[PDB]
Design a protein around this ligand. Structure first.
Ligand SMILES: Cc1ncc(C[n+]2csc(CCOP(=O)(O)OP(=O)(O)O)c2C)c(N)n1
Ligand SMILES: Cc1ncc(C[n+]2csc(CCOP(=O)(O)OP(=O)(O)O)c2C)c(N)n1
Ligand SMILES: Cc1ncc(C[n+]2csc(CCOP(=O)(O)OP(=O)(O)O)c2C)c(N)n1
Ligand SMILES: N=C(N)NCCCCC(=O)O
Ligand SMILES: N=C(N)NCCCCC(=O)O
Ligand SMILES: N=C(N)NCCCCC(=O)O
Ligand SMILES: [K+]
Ligand SMILES: [K+]
Ligand SMILES: [K+]
Ligand SMILES: [K+]
Ligand SMILES: [K+]
Ligand SMILES: [Mg+2]
Ligand SMILES: [Mg+2]
Ligand SMILES: [Mg+2]
Lengths: 563, 563, 563
């Protein structure tokens, strides 16, 4: 007779779920994962990989995804993936086993932790199953909470005895309709249209407005609408890290992405050039978690600001917009098109010196004694991605480190979510599972990953998962035998380094990949790197490329990082 | 120099607050309550009274209100008022003092409790002040969270040292605009208009539809729009306890309020009469906490259901509507008017047998040996309220007990919130604070309170507050020396009473009132009661009437209460 | 068949419980309270009264006691009683009903709150019943945690369906042994004997040592041991509020109790007299919550300190003793008797100017225009209590307010817990329930209560309970139409009053008591008061006395209140 295990997998399938990522423990006595046709288990080497792969799959598909862990330490390993999902905003259903219900004594029973209490502060919803047949409504409530803005994960704790139980379960009676939201449910304030009208009046009087676009605008389905608004009225578009690609590469209104590290990296007044003459900032789908902070746009002349978001402002201490429009992003744009219908196009401010500096970094022909420079690595990746991918296709994924902020400035994105990194959480080791998630969401597109030696090695065991699933991801490891970003912070704070806190011995990443069954090679210059990338791109199997790199810090150049 | 106490009162004033209800403790060394013109302290005898008075004032005005307690046991006493606000849904800012910041050791310092941890499970928002100048943004964040559906209380904990500090506070810089929401912010599903269209299509095919209206519809400002729709299409309106009055007394479409006790109280198939021939139930602003449960309308023929609510369904285990419309109630009705503009009037179902039974109870001419019956008491109150109030004015307030369900069935309500009682929380003692709130919200209207001996005496000390404020409330205490509802439940479960758990000795409430400075009299029949009420209504001062009553229990007739 | 209701009451009986205090709600359908012989329900007017009466009964008997509330607002009302028990340290089992187990949706179901989450921060143990037969082991675990130092309350949440269920229950099998601890289980550090020997070495070198005794010493059963030790070595004994009476009235080593208000009340350098020449302070059963703070004994010369407690020091920010002895108090005294066996008796220091000042207040012969003075009221109570009680018997109970600290200074205590007040929580309204608890623990001794108008009236409804139980308590209400303590704090912080936060209108407390069935009279001078008290003491029924009082503050005299 069918149990709560069958009822759970069956209800996930009603919500569109086809994959469950995770690591299975002793609950395997209660759940096989073959109970239900059309839903497959994806075994990873660590739970973090499972949670992040589901997060990225959820982001690109716009549908709820699922991950799985065992009791105790499985659940705690999964929590970093849950944390990724709450801060990066993706609808993940996280599931973990628990001790037999009559034996639940947290911190006393073997492997028994108070899972709901640990996960509740970092989730949209968190419950423990108590009566086997209720798992259907628990899944529904979890999906409901996950798909409400700010989107995030929901958690269900599953005692092994109840999971294997058929008490109260009747599969002859069909399940009620799932009614999965097509896009996230939002918060809407009374009179938002009047606030939108007030923003239109500010726009009329503005000489140099900009649109600053966040990931929430992509979730809402507002990209085509935003593009048409900016095009008609001649308004520049600036983005957060993952909102890169809302305009295609080469578009005249594509003014780039912001990272607080950009002035220090380029050795240039980059933020001043972007924002100094701007008099109106419209932050369309604003989220403070994406790390584009008001302090960053506050350059030069005084500005008016308009916040548009499907949530009430959580941070009035930091951001007090002149006009606050609490509504669905697409709904705002469609109303705003009506309010600005008869407006004349603007004159946009000049940022050519900034564009030249960036182009100069990408074209950098110099060779160096201590390896390549990261901007040269990314230029090579851009070239081969453009070759390998159809127009508007392809994904570059970035792990976390100093190199990541080079990705923000320099990486090609020819579609929304075409450059993927961790927006709010920024856990190192993100890259592999995000590349797994990206390649599964876009099976016929090229997927390149860039990672640093510190972050890559924190989670490199799931190379074996990439080989086992035969996912044709091409990985570049930029290696400096250091947690580089942290050495920068040491110098910023103390004006010197302390090696015991940041420095590694050597790891042969080529030999490491090959030990996992992934073909690999070392590249030490542009020519060797282009050849490696093109070989990887056409291989039909995963490929890894190790590149020696180095940084030259200017610690005085990073005042924009202050909080 | 102005302190955080001044900045706190000033920001409340900015959100429209004119009264702070509470009991002040040793934090009086940091806050006098004379700092800001236009905001006055209202001292009560118990913190429960303060929280409920603020709750009721918030409900009637639709504006955030404020209450105040000291540290430790002050905060725990206030928490029953907070629980009222969370379950009854009203926007209250609850403020409590805390131990000096450097001396916060919960359960170790004198009177030190972990206030945030204790209140967080029953609030929209809960925070402890840490930096004195931030009090302004904490008040804003509290109001934001309180005024989002489901509306509820927000809590700020105030260490006494920081409350009296002026560090970082500069009142030469004016506060930014308050932007207080004019009605609650709601959640809104994408494609709600299509769902509203599916609802119109169900109505098109229905023979006997009904509108079941809850408090959320009133908060949304939807009463006049709901009435116009009901009148155009000849659709009957049924209500929860506190949505009584959405239609005037006498209106032909006013089919009454529902209580799970109605069949038992009337010895009549009341729910079957209301719901049996109905084929479509629209639950307009549904909230389970109001205790109109799906089991109550599931009588007779199979029905389709439409849920309309500014929240995602929190209870799919219990309620699975055929159509779910997640949106602002008024927005739903306005869309629905357009979608049903071509529709004509339905034939409504006949409930005259139920109207006859109710009328029989109210007209009951018998004189009993053992005191009055509660239905005779309410009929006398109805009579004088009609005499005393202008058309569409007056409030009858009810405390909690068996008699309260007679109020639901029998009490007059000639306006929205014209009959006030506690919907979700149902704490005994509610009556006095609710009458204080109502009389302050409607200063020129008559306010009657009905309370039983058990619940009234639990909180009778605030009779002094009524005297001190000179609020012309007329109170009727229905005395049977028993927790009557609880004796009913003993008999339902065990088929007998147990007196030590439910019976009191005698309290002379006339003498009790007079000890508090409130004139009072005893009434034992309709003629005595009418005369006492008429004198009460014209007195220009508070007045109390004690009436001996008895209940004729039929414990086997309450099957509708099963959960 | 016996249900979990039977199993619960029966397991309470096994732990020596004979009374359950509280208010029953709709869970009366599942529990009558006649299931088990030897355990009786005690019905109160408010849940706060039920919690305090159990706490006080537990404190005096040294045995676990029990209280009861309904779901939602029953539980939150009880929670002020739970807070009393956690801060004042008494082993109370607190029990509250909950929604039916399958219908638990906190803040969504009618009267449903997350009880365990609300209570957990203020309790030793908190759990919800899930499987009916497990109630036996939940009671045992509740008792285990409550009877471990620091002693405090344990909480069990009881869903009404499980409470009424017989699933898994078999009463033909006897319960396992209860094994209730005779005295609290305590924390013991390795090498405490060495630390005790270090303390003995400090005592040898000290010219003027003192013993500061707290409530934990009494709980340990260490009173005779401490007295014998102090008498041999000629060491003065100073006490916290409820440790008054560890030495009999008039004993020469009885140096009195400490309150931070003492210098301000006495208009005298009282703390300087007590502590200035002291070179060694041994704090025996120290507990910061009792509000005898290190700052209070830090007068005159530098001191060494010894902390003895059955708990690890929770406040090293505030109190860093020279020697820390973590062990059972009686165990320390017995070891300390051996380590100091050969010591010569000490020369104790002079406090006669303070003794003379206290005696002067007690004998005050002036007749005032505006009422009696509180020291005159307490003097009168002392006289009649001495007349009425056997040697080493009688209880004076104090509620909370400015008069309470007069009680600390002036009130007679001829046995441990002979003067009773709230040590750590200090909730007003404490007096009535504490007098109920005291009178039931000491059925053959006189019980006097002193209370102020503010605190008393916050909880005056339980006068009916006293009347109903026929408890021969004699109550004195000292009336000044003010929350007097709070007016003092206004003057301390601001140098002026603000009446809206502190002032009441007239309440006739004689008339109020008579309305509740309690004989009462008004007294305005010593002669009338003594006559009223002597009448009350020989009445054999409860009696209430109202006394007009006034205070004349010197707000500059309260610097010792600084934190
Ligand atoms: C889970 C986690 N722990 C610690 C950090 C701090 N941290 C951020 S990025 C990073 C990696 C830096 O090293 P690497 O991947 O080699 O990038 P690099 O800065 O050298 O370019 C570290 C250690 C982190 N981001 N996440
Ligand atoms: C704070 C709280 N504790 C307990 C209850 C359970 N309860 C509900 S109403 C009530 C009082 C019922 O007696 P009364 O007010 O005299 O009205 P009656 O039932 O006699 O008509 C009680 C004890 C409650 N509602 N609230
Ligand atoms: C539950 C609670 N709320 C508020 C306080 C602050 N407070 C302490 S005692 C007290 C009463 C003081 O008035 P009264 O009982 O008349 O004694 P008085 O100070 O006038 O002597 C108050 C309001 C408190 N202790 N407990
Ligand atoms: N604006 C800032 N200071 N941002 C901090 C960035 C730290 C996260 C990261 O770069 O991985
Ligand atoms: N549907 C029910 N069983 N309702 C129970 C309501 C209990 C609270 C009351 O009667 O006020
Ligand atoms: N040391 C102090 N400041 N004590 C404050 C105690 C205030 C509570 C009371 O006096 O009842
Ligand atoms: K191409
Ligand atoms: K790992
Ligand atoms: K009239
Ligand atoms: K005597
Ligand atoms: K009370
Ligand atoms: Mg590195
Ligand atoms: Mg009654
Ligand atoms: Mg007073």
């Amino acid at each position: 007779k069918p149990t709560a295990a069958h009822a759970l997998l069956s209800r996930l399938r009603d919500h569109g779920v086809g994959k469950v990522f995770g690591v299975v423990g002793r609950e395997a006595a209660s759940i096989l994962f073959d109970e239900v046709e059309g839903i497959d288990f994806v075994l990873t080497r660590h739970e973090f990989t499972a949670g992040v792969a589901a997060d990225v799959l959820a982001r690109i598909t716009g549908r709820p995804q699922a991950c799985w862990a065992t009791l105790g330490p499985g659940m705690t390993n999964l929590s970093t993936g849950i944390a990724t999902s709450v801060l990066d905003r993706s609808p993940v259903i996280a599931l973990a086993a628990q001790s037999e219900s009559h034996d639940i004594f947290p911190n006393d029973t073997h492997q028994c932790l108070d899972s709901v209490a640990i996960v509740a502060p970092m989730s949209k919803y968190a419950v423990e199953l108590q009566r086997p047949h209720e798992i259907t409504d628990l899944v529904d409530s979890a999906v409901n909470a996950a798909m409400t803005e700010p989107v995030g994960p929901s958690f269900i704790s599953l005692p092994v005895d109840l999971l294997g139980s058929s008490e109260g379960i009747d599969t002859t009676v069909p399940n009620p309709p799932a009614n999965t939201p097509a896009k996230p449910v939002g918060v809407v304030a009374d009179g938002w249209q009047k606030a939108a009208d007030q923003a239109a009046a500010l726009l009329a009087e503005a000489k140099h407005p900009v649109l600053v676009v966040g990931a929430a605008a992509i979730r809402s389905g507002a990209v085509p609408a935003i593009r048409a608004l900016a095009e008609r009225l001649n308004i520049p578009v600036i983005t957060t890290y993952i909102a890169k690609g809302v305009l295609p590469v080469g578009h005249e209104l594509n003014y780039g992405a912001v990272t607080g590290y950009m002035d220090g990296i380029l050795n240039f007044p980059a933020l001043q050039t972007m924002f100094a003459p701007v008099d109106l900032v419209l932050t369309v789908g604003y989220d403070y978690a994406e790390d584009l902070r008001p302090s960053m746009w506050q350059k030069g002349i005084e500005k008016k600001t308009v916040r548009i978001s499907p949530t009430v402002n959580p941070i009035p201490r930091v951001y007090r917009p002149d006009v606050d429009v609490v509504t669905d992003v697409l709904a705002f744009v469609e109303h705003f098109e009506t309010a600005t219908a008869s407006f004349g196009a603007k004159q946009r401010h000049d940022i050519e010196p900034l564009r030249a500096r960036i182009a100069e970094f990408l074209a950098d022909p110099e060779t160096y004694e201590d390896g390549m420079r990261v901007h040269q690595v990314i230029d090579s990746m851009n070239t081969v991605m453009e070759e390998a991918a159809e127009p508007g296709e392809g994904t570059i994924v970035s792990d976390i480190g100093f190199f990541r902020h080079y990705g923000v400035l320099f990486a090609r994105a020819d579609q929304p979510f075409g450059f993927l990194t961790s927006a709010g959480c920024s856990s190192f080791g993100y890259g592999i599972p995000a590349a797994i998630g990206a390649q599964m969401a876009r099976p016929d597109q090229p997927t390149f990953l860039i990672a640093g030696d510190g972050g890559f090695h924190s989670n490199s065991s799931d190379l074996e998962t990439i080989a086992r699933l035969n996912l044709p991801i091409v990985t570049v490891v930029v290696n400096n035998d250091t947690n580089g970003l942290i050495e920068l912070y040491q110098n910023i704070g103390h004006h010197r380094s302390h090696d015991p806190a940041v420095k590694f011995g050597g790891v042969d990443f080529v030999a490491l990949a090959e030990a996992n069954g992934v073909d690999a090679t070392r590249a030490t210059n542009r020519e060797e790197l282009l050849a490696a990338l093109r070989k990887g791109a056409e291989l039909g199997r995963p490929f890894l490329i190790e590149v020696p790199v180095n940084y030259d810090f200017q610690p005085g150049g990073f005042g924009a990082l202050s909080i």
